[PDB]
Design an enzyme around this catalytic site. Sequence first.
Site, PDB file in Angstrom:
ATOM      1  N   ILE A  14      -4.276   2.915  93.886  1.00  0.00           N
ATOM      2  CA  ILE A  14      -4.743   2.625  95.246  1.00  0.00           C
ATOM      3  C   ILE A  14      -4.490   3.818  96.165  1.00  0.00           C
ATOM      4  O   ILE A  14      -5.375   4.210  96.922  1.00  0.00           O
ATOM      5  CB  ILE A  14      -4.073   1.357  95.823  1.00  0.00           C
ATOM      6  CG1 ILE A  14      -4.401   0.138  94.955  1.00  0.00           C
ATOM      7  CG2 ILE A  14      -4.526   1.103  97.261  1.00  0.00           C
ATOM      8  CD1 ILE A  14      -5.888  -0.158  94.843  1.00  0.00           C
ATOM      9  N   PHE A  19       6.151   6.564 101.366  1.00  0.00           N
ATOM     10  CA  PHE A  19       6.972   6.766 100.173  1.00  0.00           C
ATOM     11  C   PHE A  19       6.336   5.985  99.034  1.00  0.00           C
ATOM     12  O   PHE A  19       5.746   4.927  99.257  1.00  0.00           O
ATOM     13  CB  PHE A  19       8.408   6.277 100.391  1.00  0.00           C
ATOM     14  CG  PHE A  19       9.171   7.076 101.411  1.00  0.00           C
ATOM     15  CD1 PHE A  19       9.632   8.345 101.105  1.00  0.00           C
ATOM     16  CD2 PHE A  19       9.423   6.561 102.674  1.00  0.00           C
ATOM     17  CE1 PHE A  19      10.334   9.097 102.044  1.00  0.00           C
ATOM     18  CE2 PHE A  19      10.127   7.307 103.624  1.00  0.00           C
ATOM     19  CZ  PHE A  19      10.583   8.572 103.305  1.00  0.00           C
ATOM     20  N   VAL A  22       0.853   3.100  95.566  1.00  0.00           N
ATOM     21  CA  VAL A  22       0.356   1.737  95.388  1.00  0.00           C
ATOM     22  C   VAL A  22      -0.651   1.635  94.238  1.00  0.00           C
ATOM     23  O   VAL A  22      -1.476   2.526  94.050  1.00  0.00           O
ATOM     24  CB  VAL A  22      -0.278   1.213  96.692  1.00  0.00           C
ATOM     25  CG1 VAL A  22      -0.798  -0.202  96.513  1.00  0.00           C
ATOM     26  CG2 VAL A  22       0.739   1.276  97.826  1.00  0.00           C
ATOM     27  N   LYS A  35       3.872  -1.332  94.398  1.00  0.00           N
ATOM     28  CA  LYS A  35       4.260  -0.052  94.989  1.00  0.00           C
ATOM     29  C   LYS A  35       5.384   0.524  94.143  1.00  0.00           C
ATOM     30  O   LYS A  35       6.419  -0.118  93.945  1.00  0.00           O
ATOM     31  CB  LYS A  35       4.714  -0.215  96.441  1.00  0.00           C
ATOM     32  CG  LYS A  35       4.909   1.105  97.177  1.00  0.00           C
ATOM     33  CD  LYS A  35       5.376   0.898  98.606  1.00  0.00           C
ATOM     34  CE  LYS A  35       4.242   0.489  99.512  1.00  0.00           C
ATOM     35  NZ  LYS A  35       4.685   0.342 100.930  1.00  0.00           N
ATOM     36  N   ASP A 136       5.921   1.250 112.952  1.00  0.00           N
ATOM     37  CA  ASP A 136       4.784   2.043 112.475  1.00  0.00           C
ATOM     38  C   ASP A 136       3.513   1.203 112.336  1.00  0.00           C
ATOM     39  O   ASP A 136       2.777   1.328 111.353  1.00  0.00           O
ATOM     40  CB  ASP A 136       5.130   2.737 111.154  1.00  0.00           C
ATOM     41  CG  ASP A 136       4.199   3.904 110.836  1.00  0.00           C
ATOM     42  OD1 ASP A 136       3.473   4.377 111.741  1.00  0.00           O
ATOM     43  OD2 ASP A 136       4.205   4.353 109.672  1.00  0.00           O
TER      44      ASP A 136
HETATM   45  C1  LIG Z   1      -9.071  -1.608  97.228  1.00  0.00           C
HETATM   46  O1  LIG Z   1      -8.504  -0.717  98.197  1.00  0.00           O
HETATM   47  C2  LIG Z   1      -7.311  -1.063  98.761  1.00  0.00           C
HETATM   48  C3  LIG Z   1      -6.605  -2.232  98.454  1.00  0.00           C
HETATM   49  C4  LIG Z   1      -5.392  -2.518  99.074  1.00  0.00           C
HETATM   50  N1  LIG Z   1      -4.738  -3.719  98.722  1.00  0.00           N
HETATM   51  C5  LIG Z   1      -3.381  -4.026  98.868  1.00  0.00           C
HETATM   52  C6  LIG Z   1      -2.446  -2.996  98.860  1.00  0.00           C
HETATM   53  C7  LIG Z   1      -1.108  -3.334  98.998  1.00  0.00           C
HETATM   54  O2  LIG Z   1      -0.158  -2.333  99.005  1.00  0.00           O
HETATM   55  C8  LIG Z   1       1.170  -2.661  99.073  1.00  0.00           C
HETATM   56  C9  LIG Z   1       1.785  -3.229  97.973  1.00  0.00           C
HETATM   57  C10 LIG Z   1       3.131  -3.546  98.023  1.00  0.00           C
HETATM   58  C11 LIG Z   1       3.819  -4.183  96.832  1.00  0.00           C
HETATM   59  C12 LIG Z   1       3.810  -3.249  99.215  1.00  0.00           C
HETATM   60  C13 LIG Z   1       5.283  -3.547  99.385  1.00  0.00           C
HETATM   61  N2  LIG Z   1       3.219  -2.685 100.276  1.00  0.00           N
HETATM   62  C14 LIG Z   1       1.913  -2.392 100.214  1.00  0.00           C
HETATM   63  C15 LIG Z   1       1.341  -1.726 101.423  1.00  0.00           C
HETATM   64  C16 LIG Z   1       0.035  -1.988 101.848  1.00  0.00           C
HETATM   65  C17 LIG Z   1      -0.459  -1.325 102.962  1.00  0.00           C
HETATM   66  C18 LIG Z   1       0.374  -0.424 103.615  1.00  0.00           C
HETATM   67  C19 LIG Z   1       1.652  -0.224 103.118  1.00  0.00           C
HETATM   68  N3  LIG Z   1       2.135  -0.844 102.049  1.00  0.00           N
HETATM   69  C20 LIG Z   1      -0.728  -4.677  99.139  1.00  0.00           C
HETATM   70  C21 LIG Z   1      -1.748  -5.618  99.122  1.00  0.00           C
HETATM   71  N4  LIG Z   1      -3.048  -5.321  98.986  1.00  0.00           N
HETATM   72  C22 LIG Z   1      -4.890  -1.618 100.015  1.00  0.00           C
HETATM   73  C23 LIG Z   1      -5.581  -0.447 100.336  1.00  0.00           C
HETATM   74  O3  LIG Z   1      -5.094   0.448 101.253  1.00  0.00           O
HETATM   75  C24 LIG Z   1      -3.848   0.146 101.893  1.00  0.00           C
HETATM   76  C25 LIG Z   1      -6.795  -0.158  99.701  1.00  0.00           C
HETATM   77  O4  LIG Z   1      -7.487   0.987 100.027  1.00  0.00           O
HETATM   78  C26 LIG Z   1      -6.837   2.172  99.544  1.00  0.00           C
END
Ligand SMILES: COc1cc(Nc2cc(Oc3cc(C)c(C)nc3-c3ccccn3)ccn2)cc(OC)c1OC
Length: 303
Positions: A14, A19, A22, A35, A136
């Site tokens: 992703i 840090f 994903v 992550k 943030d």
């Molecule tokens: C398909 O494109 C994207 C999908 C997602 N989906 C998504 C991503 C996630 O990321 C995380 C996962 C976990 C375990 C944790 C703790 N944090 C995050 C996270 C998410 C956003 C910002 C910071 N941390 C969780 C759930 N669904 C996300 C995308 O971008 C953020 C996509 O495009 C790149």
Amino acid sequence: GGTIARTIVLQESIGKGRFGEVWRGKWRGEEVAVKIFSSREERSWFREAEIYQTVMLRHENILGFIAADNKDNGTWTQLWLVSDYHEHGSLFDYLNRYTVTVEGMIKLALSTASGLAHLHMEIVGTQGKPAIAHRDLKSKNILVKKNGTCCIADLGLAVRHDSATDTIDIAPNHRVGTKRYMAPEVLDDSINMKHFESFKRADIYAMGLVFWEIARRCSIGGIHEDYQLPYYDLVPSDPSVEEMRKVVCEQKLRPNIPNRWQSCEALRVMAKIMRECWYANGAARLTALRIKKTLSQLSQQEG
Ligand SMILES: COc1cc(Nc2cc(Oc3cc(C)c(C)nc3-c3ccccn3)ccn2)cc(OC)c1OC
């Protein structure tokens, strides 16, 4: 053996956040988000794990956390966080891809405000949830669910407050978040970090900017604005603190509010909320709960 990381198969990269990195993976016949952190990123992994495991945190507008774990491939150890997966990605991605209806705008804004109100609100009792400030908040840190509502993520920079003793759980540094979304008092270092309300007020300013990003994409009669980040018109793409400070603190500019937003009650209410998130003095800003109440009131009236 372990029941989490050991049993998950990674499928799709992703991208890299502040840090770690994903991924989309498969767990027990279901898509999940992972992550992954290196061993030298243990402090950031643990802290985000710690915030997400806070009692009473779960809310429809906060990313649903599954587990913290580690995985050994036989050469090195990875530190894992696992959560719900949202196919649409971030609100930033969503707003670049799509326009929204008035209803769509209200759902995205209200769900964001509700999520922030939950973070911000202390809950009393044995399962005592402290007040939590994000530090943030931005469109890239809000995820859009299939039902068209948001949930807040990226809680690794959060700070938690105990109201009885008036103590924050970590010693906060200045200017930790995304420069573009930093409040004036953050940009010029005048923020009082021994006053927990200050952190909540800084979050509100940032949510106002996010609201502006959403409203731009609200299409009525085929009329809408192109996607832009706040201050696209005034600073460089990766702006420094000094560049932000000159615009936000010195020239005292905020994102432009189109006059075509005056012609619609929903956009009129959103525009007012933005202004009342954007005062230089944080104490003048609306609370997340007040914003939630207002948008809930608006949501009833619209449909
Ligand atoms: C398909 O494109 C994207 C999908 C997602 N989906 C998504 C991503 C996630 O990321 C995380 C996962 C976990 C375990 C944790 C703790 N944090 C995050 C996270 C998410 C956003 C910002 C910071 N941390 C969780 C759930 N669904 C996300 C995308 O971008 C953020 C996509 O495009 C790149």
